[PDB]
UniProtKB/Swiss-Prot annotation, chain A:
One of its GO terms (molecular function) is L-seryl-tRNA(Sec) selenium transferase activity. Pathway: Aminoacyl-tRNA biosynthesis; selenocysteinyl-tRNA(Sec) biosynthesis; selenocysteinyl-tRNA(Sec) from L-seryl-tRNA(Sec) (bacterial route): step 1/1. The keyword Lipid biosynthesis does not apply. GO terms for biological process: conversion of seryl-tRNAsec to selenocys-tRNAsec; selenocysteine biosynthetic process; selenocysteine incorporation. The lineage of its organism: Bacteria, Pseudomonadati, Pseudomonadota, Gammaproteobacteria, Enterobacterales. This is L-seryl-tRNA(Sec) selenium transferase. Belongs to the SelA family. It comes from Escherichia coli (strain K12). It is found in: Cytoplasm. The modification N6-(pyridoxal phosphate)lysine is found at K216.
Length: 361, 359
């Protein structure tokens, strides 16, 4: 058996960064299979033709931006954005937005790689608009707002919103870019989940470029999507780095099929596996746990793109340890649970097929 | 009536930074009055230094070799940086560059103190290798700042003081700490959130620890630096110290407050800050009923996380009412929330005056 084997994610973290993040929809799977099995017009426009013009039009329809650019991932998106829009110049970032994701991604390190100069303003908790204003000079190329997707600072805090920073950049003739990261395309508060900033809101507020992932709250493939001004995007596409960061035909097919799900929001909670697992009701989980060793309430973390706070009720079955987990990790379809509160918990929020799962245990 | 008139703090914030922060004990008041009325041996050893006996008291309580006392903890940090790291780099985590109140800001304080701020790691996740890579021949300190007014939650990582002390010992670089809150007792014993103590930092091997005296300590506005005798002697000999030296009222209040910590069992009663913090919710409910009344939540105040953590009971009654109350000789300050005016009764100790004044 290969190491890329299926695994039943019962840890309660739906968007596990180490387990492939978001599961893709059946439409995305079918589009990917069709693109793999048969030749597709990747860079051959029937009407030469660019690689992601259809994707750019779809993203213009959804978010409302002028143009779009697709790269390997959001780390590549930030790298390309900084290298093509702020190379050799300063970038002003709040001292409380210098984010680290996972461990391999660090904003100061990305600025070092991209050839920019990181200008840090304000403090970790309190950043004021005057801190941004005092740092803008002739060498400043961007005002960068990074969305702290994996952490939140609580207490005595102050952050300048994107509208204020866009107004300040318009006054000082400095573009404002955003590393949104999570890239939730719908209002999560409608589904009872915590609200996250949307690319539509940032695009409407006047942000020149907004970069977000595709495997996070978007529910698609690993991709880095940069949407915004036509001039800025055209700068990105013409950069020498883009050839290294361009997106595969499987990635483009999955991304387009996923984005077409957002054109019919009524079925979005059903067609999108990420949303279906996130908005799964707790009563159904309780019933499934009882049907399938004690069942008690647990809390499930959303995963990547959202704050690691659990914030989601669920029901889990517990085994009342280390050797049991080791034995479970050796199955043809490994079952990963969590050693929480001295017990082995199997959160049943992400268990979609009970018939298959019950065979291994 | 002056602008420093008494005010009945019913906002639920016990340690209101804009309202004098911590209230002082009766022993502190008596010692202050005694030093106020009569001459005291401020610099006359029965010459001796200004704060030798108070440094002895701090050594007894915390366990440090020596101690220095300045105007406030902002002055403590400024003097520490200007006397131990002037002209040299200081390594501070990128997630500890803190702003307190609005006038105190770590990068600006380091700029004023003549040091070079070296920022390591990221805002949420700082590793020990980030500290290690920044240490060079120009590095003078590894500074750990306690984020007293905020907490970063989520995917985070902070290097504790023990690891940093070990790293500095390996690299021959001293480690200092801007503790700030300066809680001298384990608050978890009273059901309150635990906060780092100067005793723990001094035991762990931190060269210098600076904390306030009006925060969780419950004394006067003072900046107390405790640590190694050599670095303290560097602080006391700095030109800045003369500008930052502490008043005789400050020293009297600080000693009378610190002497309460030598009698821990009565500390929950003789310390007004602790007495208001450990006040039971049932008594507040009874007092509110005697004086609508519904549950509310109260903040600890300065030095702790600004979160409505402590259960309490509030009396509710809008903006014109607050404006009329602010005209009173003994003003009553409440909070406007949910279209209602709330008075938290956790911090109310004299119900007779408040009842007479409201009626």
């Amino acid at each position: 058996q290969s190491a890329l084997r299926p695994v039943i994610n019962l840890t309660g973290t739906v968007l596990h960064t180490n387990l492939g993040r978001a599961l893709q929809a059946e439409a995305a799977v079918e589009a990917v299979a069709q693109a793999m099995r048969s030749p597709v017009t990747l860079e051959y426009d029937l009407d030469r033709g660019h690689r992601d013009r259809a994707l750019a039009q779809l993203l213009c329809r959804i978010t409302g931006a002028e143009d779009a650019c697709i790269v390997n991932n959001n780390a590549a998106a930030v790298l390309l954005m900084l290298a093509a829009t702020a190379s050799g110049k300063e970038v002003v970032v709040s001292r409380g937005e210098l984010v680290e994701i996972g461990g391999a991604f660090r904003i100061p390190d990305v600025m070092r790689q991209a050839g920019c100069t990181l200008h840090e303003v304000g403090t970790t908790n309190r950043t004021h608009a005057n801190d941004y204003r005092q740092a803008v000079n002739e060498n400043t190329a961007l005002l960068m707002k990074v969305h702290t997707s994996n952490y939140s600072i609580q207490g005595f805090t102050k952050a300048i919103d994107e509208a204020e920073l866009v107004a300040l950049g318009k006054e000082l003739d400095v573009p404002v870019v955003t590393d949104l990261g999570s890239g939730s395309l719908v209002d999560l508060s409608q589904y009872g989940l915590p609200k996250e900033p949307m690319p539509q809101e940032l695009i409407a507020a006047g942000v020149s470029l907004v970069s977000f992932s595709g495997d996070k709250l978007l529910g698609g493939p690993q991709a880095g999507i940069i949407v915004g001004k036509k001039e800025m995007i055209a700068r990105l596409q013409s950069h020498p780095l883009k050839r290294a960061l361009r997106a595969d035909k499987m990635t483009l097919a999955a991304l387009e099929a996923t984005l077409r799900l957002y054109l019919h929001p009524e079925a979005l909670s059903e067609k999108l596996p990420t949303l279906r697992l996130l908005t799964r009701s707790a009563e159904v989980i309780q019933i499934q746990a009882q049907r399938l060793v004690q069942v008690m309430p647990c809390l499930s973390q959303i995963g990547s793109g959202s704050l690691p706070v659990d914030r989601l009720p669920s029901a889990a079955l517990t085994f009342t340890l280390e050797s049991l987990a080791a034995r479970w990790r050796e199955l043809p379809v490994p079952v990963i649970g969590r050693i929480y509160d001295g017990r082995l918990w199997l959160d049943l929020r992400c268990l979609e097929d009970e018939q298959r799962f019950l065979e291994m245990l």
